[PDB]
Structure formats: structure tokens, C-alpha cells
Design a protein around this ligand. Structure first.
Ligand SMILES: CC(=O)N[C@@H]1[C@@H](O)[C@H](O[C@@H]2O[C@H](CO)[C@@H](O[C@@H]3O[C@H](CO)[C@@H](O[C@@H]4O[C@H](CO)[C@@H](O)[C@H](O)[C@H]4NC(C)=O)[C@H](O)[C@H]3NC(C)=O)[C@H](O)[C@H]2NC(C)=O)[C@@H](CO)O[C@H]1O
Ligand SMILES: [Cl-]
Ligand SMILES: [Cl-]
Length: 130
């Protein structure tokens, strides 16, 4: 499913992402926007290292979910990567929360550094009622 901006912001707020491990809701919104355009079925194969990025947050198979075909991978979220392609984002959110419990936090996504860090991210949540 492709979420509408404010529909996603309200969903993420109900799922407890606002301020999770110090990350504001607008930062999560900025990340989803640049990673997948708010699309849960998005996938990106990284031919250079044989891993795949899955779902609305483009979570990588080398560390976070199991797809079976990525060499030397682990599955820290304890999920099949298929779980990250559902229209319901509860599993993807639980996984994203796990990602930021590691030391890099939100920096785990290079798109966040390029597109969101030190920017005015209020634009992503303006007028959504969150
Ligand atoms: C070419 C390209 O840009 N590909 C993109 C992917 O790079 C990108 O996904 C991110 O990939 C990075 C790079 O490896 C990955 O970072 C690693 O994350 C693990 C897990 O947190 C780290 O390992 C942990 O380190 C701490 C430090 O002590 C330990 O506490 C813990 O035991 C370690 N766990 C493991 C399993 O090793 C690595 O240190 C870290 N490596 C580096 C170099 O920083 C990110 O997690 C990936 N991010 C996500 C969200 O999956 C992907 C994201 O969209 O985009 C591809 O296109
Ligand atoms: Cl699963
Ligand atoms: Cl699995």
C-alpha cells in the first residue's frame, strides 16, 4: 500500500514512534519518504553485496530479517523479510524500533543523513494533527 502523508503520521504516532529512542516522529516520516515514497511493497536489490532492502523503511536483509539468499546474514528482528512487505506496518515498525536500539540509532539509514539530518523536517508532519 502507498500511504498518504498524514495517514502515515497518525499511524506511526499510534504505534509509539514519536520520540522512540530519541527520534521525533518527523524524522521517521522524512526517512519513510526518502526510502520508499511511503510504499510498503518497495524492494531494492543491492547487486554489489547480494542483500535486499525491504518495505516502507527499506530494512536490509544482511542484518535485520531473513530472506535465505543473502550470504553471511543475521536476522535481528526475528522476522521473514516477507513480513516487511505487508500493508499492515506493525511488524516493520517493531523492526525499525529494533534497528535504532543499536548504537548508530537513526544513522543506520544513510538516506537519513543525506536527506533529513540537520534539516527542517517539520514539513513532513505539518497539518496532520499529530
Ligand atoms: C550500497 C548501499 O548503500 N546499500 C544500502 C545499505 O547499506 C543500507 O543498510 C544499512 O547497511 C549498513 C551497512 O552494513 C548496516 O550497518 C551495520 O548495522 C549492523 C547492525 O546494527 C552493525 O552491527 C552491529 O554493530 C554494533 C557495534 O558494536 C554491535 O553492537 C552489534 O553486535 C552489531 N551487529 C552486527 C550484526 O554486526 C554494523 O556495525 C553496521 N555496519 C556499519 C558499517 O555501520 C545498517 O544496519 C543497514 N541499515 C538498515 C536500515 O538496514 C540500506 C538501508 O536502506 O540501503 C542499502 O541500499
Ligand atoms: Cl515472520
Ligand atoms: Cl524466516
Amino acid at each position: 500500500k502507498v500511504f498518504e502523508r498524514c495517514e502515515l503520521a497518525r499511524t506511526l504516532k499510534r504505534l509509539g514512534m514519536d520520540g522512540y529512542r530519541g527520534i521525533s516522529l518527523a524524522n521517521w516520516m522524512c526517512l519513510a519518504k526518502w526510502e520508499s515514497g511511503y510504499n510498503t511493497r518497495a524492494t531494492n536489490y543491492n547487486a554489489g553485496d547480494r542483500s535486499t532492502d525491504y518495505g516502507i523503511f527499506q530494512i536490509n536483509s544482511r542484518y535485520w530479517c531473513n530472506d535465505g539468499k543473502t550470504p553471511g546474514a543475521v536476522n535481528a528482528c526475528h522476522l521473514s523479510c516477507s513480513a516487511l512487505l505487508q500493508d499492515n506496518i506493525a511488524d516493520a515498525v517493531a523492526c525499525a524500533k529494533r534497528v535504532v536500539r543499536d548504537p548508530q540509532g537513526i544513522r543506520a539509514w544513510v538516506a537519513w543523513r543525506n536527506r533529513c539530518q540537520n534539516r527542517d523536517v517539520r514539513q513532513y508532519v505539518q497539518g496532520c494533527g499529530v
